[PDB]
Design a protein around this motif. Structure first.
Motif, PDB file in Angstrom:
ATOM      1  N   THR A  70       0.844  -1.180   0.076  1.00 19.55           N
ATOM      2  CA  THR A  70      -0.011  -0.023   0.023  1.00 19.55           C
ATOM      3  C   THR A  70       1.077   1.392   0.264  1.00 19.55           C
ATOM      4  O   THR A  70       0.485   2.088  -0.548  1.00 19.55           O
ATOM      5  CB  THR A  70      -1.038   0.240   0.910  1.00 19.55           C
ATOM      6  OG1 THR A  70      -1.923  -1.353   1.631  1.00 19.55           O
ATOM      7  CG2 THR A  70      -1.956   1.430   1.321  1.00 19.55           C
ATOM      8  N   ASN A 112       0.942   3.566  -3.674  1.00 24.35           N
ATOM      9  CA  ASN A 112       0.996   4.862  -3.076  1.00 24.35           C
ATOM     10  C   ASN A 112       1.677   5.636  -3.626  1.00 24.35           C
ATOM     11  O   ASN A 112       1.855   6.697  -4.304  1.00 24.35           O
ATOM     12  CB  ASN A 112       0.099   5.036  -2.107  1.00 24.35           C
ATOM     13  CG  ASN A 112      -1.214   4.228  -2.364  1.00 24.35           C
ATOM     14  OD1 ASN A 112      -2.209   3.363  -3.005  1.00 24.35           O
ATOM     15  ND2 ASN A 112      -1.948   4.097  -1.064  1.00 24.35           N
ATOM     16  N   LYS A 143      -2.793  -1.307  -8.253  1.00 21.70           N
ATOM     17  CA  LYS A 143      -3.034  -0.685  -6.846  1.00 21.70           C
ATOM     18  C   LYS A 143      -4.696  -1.217  -6.299  1.00 21.70           C
ATOM     19  O   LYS A 143      -5.205  -1.898  -6.700  1.00 21.70           O
ATOM     20  CB  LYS A 143      -3.620   1.129  -6.918  1.00 21.70           C
ATOM     21  CG  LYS A 143      -2.746   2.233  -7.775  1.00 21.70           C
ATOM     22  CD  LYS A 143      -2.808   3.268  -7.683  1.00 21.70           C
ATOM     23  CE  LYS A 143      -3.603   2.919  -9.581  1.00 21.70           C
ATOM     24  NZ  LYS A 143      -3.744   4.860 -10.204  1.00 21.70           N
ATOM     25  N   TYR A 144      -4.957  -0.379  -4.647  1.00 27.10           N
ATOM     26  CA  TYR A 144      -5.595  -1.281  -4.082  1.00 27.10           C
ATOM     27  C   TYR A 144      -7.157  -0.985  -4.888  1.00 27.10           C
ATOM     28  O   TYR A 144      -7.838  -1.948  -5.063  1.00 27.10           O
ATOM     29  CB  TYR A 144      -5.719  -0.101  -2.840  1.00 27.10           C
ATOM     30  CG  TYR A 144      -6.888  -0.555  -1.599  1.00 27.10           C
ATOM     31  CD1 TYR A 144      -6.947  -2.042  -1.067  1.00 27.10           C
ATOM     32  CD2 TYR A 144      -8.137   0.091  -1.465  1.00 27.10           C
ATOM     33  CE1 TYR A 144      -7.736  -2.525  -0.184  1.00 27.10           C
ATOM     34  CE2 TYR A 144      -9.190  -0.592  -0.682  1.00 27.10           C
ATOM     35  CZ  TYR A 144      -9.215  -1.010  -0.091  1.00 27.10           C
ATOM     36  OH  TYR A 144     -10.454  -2.266   0.163  1.00 27.10           O
ATOM     37  N   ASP A 145      -7.595   0.167  -4.900  1.00 29.37           N
ATOM     38  CA  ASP A 145      -8.874   0.173  -5.890  1.00 29.37           C
ATOM     39  C   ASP A 145      -9.439  -0.725  -7.126  1.00 29.37           C
ATOM     40  O   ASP A 145      -9.772  -1.235  -7.146  1.00 29.37           O
ATOM     41  CB  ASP A 145      -8.691   1.371  -6.008  1.00 29.37           C
ATOM     42  CG  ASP A 145      -8.332   2.016  -7.035  1.00 29.37           C
ATOM     43  OD1 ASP A 145      -7.235   1.839  -7.454  1.00 29.37           O
ATOM     44  OD2 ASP A 145      -8.606   2.725  -7.858  1.00 29.37           O
ATOM     45  N   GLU A 146      -7.813  -1.258  -7.438  1.00 27.11           N
ATOM     46  CA  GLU A 146      -7.965  -1.477  -9.470  1.00 27.11           C
ATOM     47  C   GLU A 146      -8.028  -3.079  -8.248  1.00 27.11           C
ATOM     48  O   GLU A 146      -8.633  -3.649  -9.161  1.00 27.11           O
ATOM     49  CB  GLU A 146      -6.643  -0.749  -9.951  1.00 27.11           C
ATOM     50  CG  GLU A 146      -5.846   0.250 -10.105  1.00 27.11           C
ATOM     51  CD  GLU A 146      -5.135   0.649 -10.838  1.00 27.11           C
ATOM     52  OE1 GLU A 146      -5.208   0.477 -12.130  1.00 27.11           O
ATOM     53  OE2 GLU A 146      -3.875   0.021 -10.239  1.00 27.11           O
ATOM     54  N   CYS A 158      -9.742  -4.295  -6.111  1.00 25.70           N
ATOM     55  CA  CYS A 158     -10.804  -4.220  -5.586  1.00 25.70           C
ATOM     56  C   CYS A 158     -11.257  -4.705  -6.684  1.00 25.70           C
ATOM     57  O   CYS A 158     -12.830  -5.362  -6.583  1.00 25.70           O
ATOM     58  CB  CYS A 158     -10.855  -3.232  -4.123  1.00 25.70           C
ATOM     59  SG  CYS A 158     -10.787  -3.326  -3.387  1.00 25.70           S
ATOM     60  N   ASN A 159     -11.777  -3.606  -8.326  1.00 26.82           N
ATOM     61  CA  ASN A 159     -12.731  -3.627  -8.653  1.00 26.82           C
ATOM     62  C   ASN A 159     -12.622  -5.189  -9.778  1.00 26.82           C
ATOM     63  O   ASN A 159     -13.150  -4.769 -10.444  1.00 26.82           O
ATOM     64  CB  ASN A 159     -12.316  -2.528 -10.013  1.00 26.82           C
ATOM     65  CG  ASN A 159     -11.929  -1.116  -9.414  1.00 26.82           C
ATOM     66  OD1 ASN A 159     -13.402  -1.092  -7.642  1.00 26.82           O
ATOM     67  ND2 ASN A 159     -11.479  -0.494  -9.272  1.00 26.82           N
ATOM     68  N   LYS A 215     -16.956  -4.915  -2.980  1.00 26.21           N
ATOM     69  CA  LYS A 215     -17.662  -3.304  -3.000  1.00 26.21           C
ATOM     70  C   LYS A 215     -17.515  -3.829  -1.143  1.00 26.21           C
ATOM     71  O   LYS A 215     -18.306  -4.802  -0.844  1.00 26.21           O
ATOM     72  CB  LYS A 215     -18.608  -3.589  -3.555  1.00 26.21           C
TER      73      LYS A 215
END
Length: 749
Positions: free
Chosen positions: A260, A264, A396-399, A401-402, A407
């Motif tokens: 992370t 980042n 990345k963390y959001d990528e 998760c997607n 969710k």
RNA sequence: GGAAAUUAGGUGCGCUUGGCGUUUUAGUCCCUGAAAAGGGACUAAAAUAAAGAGUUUGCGGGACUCUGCGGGGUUACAAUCCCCUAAAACCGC
DNA sequence: CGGTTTCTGCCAAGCGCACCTAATTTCC
DNA sequence: AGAAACCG
């Protein structure tokens, strides 16, 4: 239909308003208390109960050990009829003198027993840490230095303080601590050393013990339980709410936090400096972390560029102090489960048993047991197993998760009425009963409005302490169903906008000193002589306090002689005890606790009223009192009046019960809140609903004859000859209802 | 506004302990007094909410554990109703 | 009777959990 | 906050 509900949520009040088609419809204030730590007194008494109960058992254990070893009687070390125990009777040598003899000559086994029990009863502070030092920490260090010139704590206390005179004084100085001073506090490890030293020196003088006596005396007297299991207090994963959060000191959590920070930072340099970094640049910063659990800022700069300043501070970009200690002590599920056991099981013995289940030698179990982990992430192992493989690939963390369709859990089924806050995923975030209680009253008022007026379009909350309003907003928008706007329902109103609009509308100095101002704030949130007409219609709602639990008596233990003058010698004290005017617990006289309830009777022929006071101790005893108070002269106790068949139970009163009363001086009855029943004068304390002094009428000024701008309270209103004395009920919205007759509620045991 | 992370400070809740204080039964030392009777300093020990409950394990025990001043739900009201709110070991047979 | 006064247990050391706040980084 | 003695 432009239906708006507005709420001003305070720490003790709920002001609400209702407007439909831009027209004010209803108004009200809910005062639910008048004290920012509710559970604290309960916790202190609980901690104190258990500490002393364990001390008694620990001392009972040692009395058993010496009664078997020394062939002494166990009951000789216990009290008989509140009298001093037999082993301590007669002219006694002090334990401080005995503890000094133990270093020079042989003690009798009677003396040795009192030496063990003296050291064990007060075994000293357990200085586990060994950073501003408080009173006790400074004392144990000051006493540690002076302790070096003596063989034991006992010799130190006996020669420096025991029966030693103060400077130019005929009075002994103190050995124990006195009057809020901690000057004598000595670390527990020194008192263990003394008892071990006493055993050793007593062996040399010809005292023989069993093989396991010293071992058991030492372990029992200094046993200390670890932290109780607290795993149920750990929060849940924000993705998989059925999973517990992962411990920060686990291999996955070490990898996740490292990736992370690194990913980042690399993306932060791309958005601010335009430098795109390779996946090998990620593995360079990662391998430097995985080597020693550390990564300095200068090495991050060196591994990719110049000595430049990010938005950072300190020496370390990644700092896992417990990483090196964990690897030196040592399947991936086993490593992650072991780290969970270290974080939770603070009992080293129980931790060894848990670690023994895994294929590890005893040298590893002992090194793993000495580790101290704490803290958790906000996601679980199950989530870390999914996201960390993708983030190792640079994502990345959001990528990540997607790509995994992860969710955050958000409620989907909305209800007509707001469900209990305890049934939502917001519950685990709030442990403070003050917040829980304010949320409870917000729910009660809202659902009352929905029951009375039906579904609404928008709800407005005042946000000022501020996060509680943000919490209530997310609470309502996630769980409450609304009417559609066409074809956002919960809004927050800025507190700075309220005070300015309060001046713009002209309500800035209207009712600042009474309860009604919480409603005028709710009306402003919902959006001039038309709204004030609705403010004057407000009856302030307060709940009656029916809670029967609480302190059973005052904490001050008192000699019965203190009551001889007031009650009339020891004859009157016994009478007061029979009536419940005082209690005796553990042979100690104590005053009553809260009078949580008073039962009102009416004589069937004379129509005189009578009151039976009911205290927390009466509910604990599960015996319902049945004698009404009678006034007595100055130094005596007149008989109380038994409520026999001539008297008729009317109703029960609790604090903030609503009553309608009329004294003989009054021309009309008045609604007031009952506050207290004064037993010495058989009279009431009552207050006006809105505490508003300005709108006092002629009839109300007779009752509240000593009212002022701060409080509208009437005291010492005698009940016996009251013209009207009826009970009413207040809904959460301020609706007043005559209280139907209910039979007297009893205690069941 | 929302998700994740880091550091620092703080709030609350929870747990494990320590030291007082008080009440009680005695003792140590000193002081006033003819006596009777008092006074002070100090030490020990007991008690420190009333009172209850319990499985591991057939039974019993305490030299075992837990509940006992809080919160939520329910509703002419919010309570004594319903939840938060138990579980092992040891000793003897 | 009815108006007023009196009197309420306390502090310390450290370990956990849930949060808050103040900065800071990545995303929506 | 809150019980209840005090006091005239």
């Amino acid at each position: 239909m432009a239906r708006i509900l507005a709420f001003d949520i305070g720490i003790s009040s709920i002001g609400w308003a209702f407007s439909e088609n831009d027209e004010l419809k209803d108004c009200g204030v809910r005062i639910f208390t008048k004290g920012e730590s509710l559970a604290l007194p309960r916790r202190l008494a609980r901690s104190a109960r258990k500490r002393l109960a364990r001390r008694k058992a620990r001392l009972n254990h040692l009395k058993h050990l010496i009664a078997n070893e020394f062939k002494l009687n166990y009951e000789d070390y216990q009290s008989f009829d509140e009298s001093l125990a037999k082993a301590y009777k007669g002219s006694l040598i002090s334990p401080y003198e005995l503890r000094f003899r133990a270093l020079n000559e042989l003690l009798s086994k009677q003396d040795f027993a009192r030496v063990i029990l003296h050291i064990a009863k007060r075994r000293g502070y357990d200085d586990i840490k060994n950073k501003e030092k408080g009173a006790i920490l400074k004392a144990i260090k000051q006493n540690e230095e002076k302790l070096a010139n003596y063989q034991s704590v006992g010799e130190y206390l006996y020669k420096e303080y025991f029966q030693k005179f103060k400077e130019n004084s005929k009075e002994f100085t103190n050995v124990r601590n006195k009057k809020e001073s901690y000057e004598r506090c000595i670390a527990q490890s020194f008192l263990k050393d003394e008892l071990k030293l006493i055993f050793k020196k007593q062996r040399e003088f010809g005292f023989s013990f069993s093989k396991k006596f010293e071992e058991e005396v030492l372990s029992v007297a200094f046993y200390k339980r670890a932290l109780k299991d607290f795993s149920h207090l750990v929060g849940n994963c924000s993705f998989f709410t059925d999973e517990k959060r992962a411990p920060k000191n686990s291999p996955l959590a070490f990898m996740f936090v490292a990736l992370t920070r690194i990913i980042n930072l690399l993306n932060n340099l791309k958005n601010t400096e335009g430098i795109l970094y390779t996946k090998d640049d990620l593995n360079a910063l990662l391998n430097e972390v995985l080597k020693n659990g550390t990564l300095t800022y200068k090495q991050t700069k060196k591994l990719l560029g110049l000595s430049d300043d990010y938005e950072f501070k300190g020496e370390k970009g990644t700092y896992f102090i417990e990483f090196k200690k964990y690897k030196e002590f040592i399947s991936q599920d086993d490593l992650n489960e072991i780290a969970k056991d270290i974080t939770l099981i603070k009992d080293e013995i129980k931790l060894k048993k848990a670690l023994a289940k895994y294929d590890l030698n005893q040298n590893q179990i002992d090194s793993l047991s000495k580790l101290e982990f704490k803290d958790h992430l906000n996601i679980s192992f199950k989530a870390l197993k999914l996201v960390t493989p993708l983030m190792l690939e640079g994502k990345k963390y959001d990528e990540a998760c997607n790509e995994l369709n992860l969710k955050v859990a958000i409620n989907e089924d909305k209800k007509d009425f707001l469900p209990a806050f305890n049934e939502t995923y917001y519950k685990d975030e709030v442990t403070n009963p003050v917040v829980l209680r304010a949320i409870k009253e917000y729910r009660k008022v809202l659902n009352a409005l929905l029951k009375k007026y039906g579904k609404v379009h928008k709800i407005n909350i005042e946000l000022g302490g501020g996060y509680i309003a943000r919490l209530v907003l997310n609470y309502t928008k996630d769980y409450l169903d609304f009417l559609p706007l066409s074809d956002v329902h919960v809004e927050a109103k800025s507190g700075m906008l309220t005070s300015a609009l309060r001046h713009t509308w002209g309500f800035s100095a209207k009712d600042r000193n009474n309860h009604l101002h919480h409603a005028i704030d709710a009306v402003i949130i919902a959006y001039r002589q038309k709204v004030l007409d609705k403010i004057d219609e407000i009856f302030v709602s307060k709940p009656e306090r029916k809670k029967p639990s609480g302190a059973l008596h005052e904490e001050t233990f008192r000699k019965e002689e203190e009551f001889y003058q007031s009650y009339g010698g020891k004859e009157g004290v016994l009478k007061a005890l029979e009536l419940g005017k005082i209690r005796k617990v553990n042979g100690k006289i104590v005053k009553n606790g809260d009078m949580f309830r008073v039962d009102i009777f009416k004589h069937k022929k004379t129509n005189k009223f009578y009151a039976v006071p009911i205290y927390t101790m009466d509910f604990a005893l599960k015996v319902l009192p049945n004698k009404a108070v009678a006034r007595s002269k100055k130094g005596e106790i007149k008989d109380w009046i038994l409520m026999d068949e001539n008297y008729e139970f009317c109703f029960s009163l609790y604090k903030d019960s609503l009553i309608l009363i009329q004294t003989k001086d009054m021309q009309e009855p008045e609604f007031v809140y009952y506050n207290a029943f004064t037993s010495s004068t058989v009279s009431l304390i009552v207050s006006k609903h809105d505490n508003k002094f300005e709108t006092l009428s002629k009839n109300q000024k007779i009752l509240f004859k000593n009212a002022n701008e701060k409080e509208v309270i009437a005291k010492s209103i005698g009940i016996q000859n009251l013209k009207v004395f009826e009970k009413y009920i207040v809904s959460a919205l301020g609706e007043v209802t005559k209280a139907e007759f209910r039979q007297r509620e009893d205690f069941k045991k």
